[PDB]
Design a protein around this nucleic acid. Sequence first.
DNA 1: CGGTAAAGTGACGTTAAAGTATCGTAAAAGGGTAGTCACTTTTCGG
DNA 2: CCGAAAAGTGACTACCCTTTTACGATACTTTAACGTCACTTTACCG
Lengths: 204, 205, 203, 206
Amino acid sequence: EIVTSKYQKIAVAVAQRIANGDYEVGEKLKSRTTIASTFNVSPETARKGLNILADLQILTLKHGSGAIILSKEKAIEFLNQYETSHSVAILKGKIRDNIKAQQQEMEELATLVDDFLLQTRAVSKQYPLAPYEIIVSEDSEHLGKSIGELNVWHQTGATIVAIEHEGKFIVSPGPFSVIEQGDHIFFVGDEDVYARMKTYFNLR
Amino acid sequence: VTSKYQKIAVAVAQRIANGDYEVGEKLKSRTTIASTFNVSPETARKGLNILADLQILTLKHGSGAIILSKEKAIEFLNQYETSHSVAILKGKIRDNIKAQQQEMEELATLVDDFLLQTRAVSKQYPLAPYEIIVSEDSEHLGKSIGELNVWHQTGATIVAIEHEGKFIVSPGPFSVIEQGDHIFFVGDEDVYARMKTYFNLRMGL
Amino acid sequence: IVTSKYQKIAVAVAQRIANGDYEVGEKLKSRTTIASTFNVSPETARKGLNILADLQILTLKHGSGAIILSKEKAIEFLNQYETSHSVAILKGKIRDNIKAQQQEMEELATLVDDFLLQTRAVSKQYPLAPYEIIVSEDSEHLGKSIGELNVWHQTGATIVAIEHEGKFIVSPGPFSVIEQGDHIFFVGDEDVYARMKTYFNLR
Amino acid sequence: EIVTSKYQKIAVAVAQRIANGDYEVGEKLKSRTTIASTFNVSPETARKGLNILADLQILTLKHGSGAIILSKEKAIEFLNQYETSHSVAILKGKIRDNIKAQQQEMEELATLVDDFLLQTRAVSKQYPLAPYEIIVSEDSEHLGKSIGELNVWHQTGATIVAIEHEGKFIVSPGPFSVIEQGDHIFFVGDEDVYARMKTYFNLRMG
DNA sequence: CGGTAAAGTGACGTTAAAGTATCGTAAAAGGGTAGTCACTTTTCGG
DNA sequence: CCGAAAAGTGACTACCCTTTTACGATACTTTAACGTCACTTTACCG
Ligand SMILES: Nc1ncnc2c1ncn2[C@@H]1O[C@@H]2COP(=O)(O)O[C@H]3[C@@H](O)[C@H](n4cnc5c(N)ncnc54)O[C@@H]3COP(=O)(O)O[C@H]2[C@H]1O
Ligand SMILES: Nc1ncnc2c1ncn2[C@@H]1O[C@@H]2COP(=O)(O)O[C@H]3[C@@H](O)[C@H](n4cnc5c(N)ncnc54)O[C@@H]3COP(=O)(O)O[C@H]2[C@H]1O
């Protein structure tokens, strides 16, 4: 997710304090070791954060001395740009997460289409008396009705051989079997009957 | 297609060009660069090798980095930016997004035919139908499936009739069963027993 | 959680057994011959034959080959394989994947929109570097607007900003007034700079 | 872009000949080196192509007797089966080209947006001013006109500092400089002036 | 009171460690190769 | 004319080579800490 440098984190924190006014312009800061203990960091790590601010003309520290705040206006500008552009950073990170996730989806797609082709080949390899099958997952006035109430053969030309409901099968279902949403209908007919069944159950 | 070494180069060229490093001021070479940019000394060294190759600085003094000319640093910045991507980078990203949008449209249509080329989905379950040859005399011959009311008589769902070697799939109630036809139907073993009895086939094993 | 060629071998051989092409008594060819017929490794063929062995469709205690065991259990295995593998279920997954990818790209499009909006355009760090003069000398051109002076036609300069009493107006237009002591920021070349200096009596 | 084993090619070729009738049913496909010489291929790749044929039950094999042709109807059916499924597989191979190019453009997008962030922080470190740069790449009633004819400052609030045309820059352009399609316009102003310039030159660009 | 020297503290620079990424090597599998094995056909001899 | 032997070819198999994928190791980069150096302040002495 979001990771920044600890050095940067310290720099941003102290720059925010300066911009808020805790450290006024011209405020002395003979520091290193004291603020290092405030931040529970090695005294040396403190400078790693405060000379980056000096080259950026936010403060001035002579050798062996304390940091003197220089420009309120420029420290404010820098802190603002950094935080709003670290929001630029968070948006950037979300784009990289999104594109990597999409590469993950497209890799799954690759294996799916290879697997799809493999199954189409293996399924064709038999041919005893293959029937036609659909999943009635869309809303339709034909759901919650029995096969006889629908009068299926007269509506679509299909002969239903089996209904799968909640993973269970009824073969040779008869007129009293009910077709419910999500059920699988196995049926025989030709390509036109398959097309009729798809339209009849609002499947495309 | 770029690494942060270029960014270092631009940053230090910017300092030189603004006048932050006065004309002829010396840097502490790798140590100063690493302390400033947080970049490693090995990348930094190539970063400054860039400005050496363009004569913005000289490194023949192991001590550090001597800056040479502010005018050449400004030249560097300009050509660098123009040959790289800034407002072009915004345009390139837009072009990339639109190219991928078109590629996805092509993909959507490809898959449509791929899926529609499957004009049906089969199962090859054990639901494959029993086959009986109605070769014996029977009161049921010469009648239509609907007149017989077959499912209610035997529990069978007829999927096809073979008559004179020709098949009718999904036969409906008006198809007639004639002597010698083959009836294909789904059911279980008990449905098979009912069909065999119904059509006077008790002789068959 | 379903990817295998050995399963394709398993179903193929089970379909042969169940249809009756391979009678019960009959022996299958060598594990190496089946691997070559199905164009795969002997090891994957070993997995396929182990599948039907675990389902008691074949036994391999003989080196000559695999002996067929049960035609009905091959049929029993075809039913279970149908369930596990699934047919249009596979197609449906591809449609869902495509739909999810389209939504992910819509999210990406909007993300980039804000990223690019930012708030403004950009910069090319050009030597456009605008000149600055301070109009501190007396001049008949002071107390006049940029349009009244017709500056570009007089000096070749394009004024980008005026500083007046320490405050800035950027893109000033023809109605902005140049007063004594103001700073004029402008673009042009060295000759334009020279014209501006002379024009405002800065020699 | 085609990856069918050599064996499989050999099988298809000889099966096609059988289905055409060049190799009749009782006629024996004898001479294995002689079959290798027919296609100038190795005799063992040919022998195995024929073996895969024999195992799909198109021809029968036996010592001393060249492969005898068994069934016309089934060899014909199998030829047609390979004809459909192989093009199905080629269509599958196509979606692969799409996913590959798109993954490449995503890896490309990732680098582009990383550098875009790099540019934003780099330009945030500016000097007195950074003029907005627009590329007038869209069709517009304003193209082919001079800055003075357009009366740009009064239309948009922008002061144009330079035009880039055919890679050449004119600084301090004046009213007689013309804006042509594809030019880069550099101008000063604020965020609102930028919005006016973008609208004025038909750059909504969604 | 002024100057000098010493000590202490803060900063800067350099080096080391840890984590992540990339590349190379190795292993496994899938597909082609020649050697061997057997069977059938042809020729010769009885 | 029939039988036997030899030769040629089909059938068989163990193997080898090539390609792809996965894992491991090395390298690089970033962040932290130890050490050393400089500057400032104080105290003491002249
Ligand atoms: N292929 C077949 N196999 C076995 N028997 C068949 C049959 N076709 C028709 N019948 C029999 O004839 C009756 C009328 O069939 P019909 O198709 O007109 O009218 C049918 C049909 O439109 C529909 N239906 C019933 N089962 C169906 C199924 N499995 N598939 C499609 N439609 C079915 O409900 C109506 C009443 O069905 P019900 O079973 O009470 O009554 C059925 C049934 O006893
Ligand atoms: N670089 C530019 N960017 C944007 N628009 C430009 C432009 N150059 C010319 N125009 C537009 O064309 C009009 C006539 O410009 P011209 O240079 O002849 O006549 C100008 C010019 O001599 C002078 N002027 C105005 N603004 C100026 C400026 N920022 N710098 C220098 N001269 C300016 O006053 C006259 C009237 O100015 P006004 O703005 O009413 O009208 C301007 C303006 O609308």
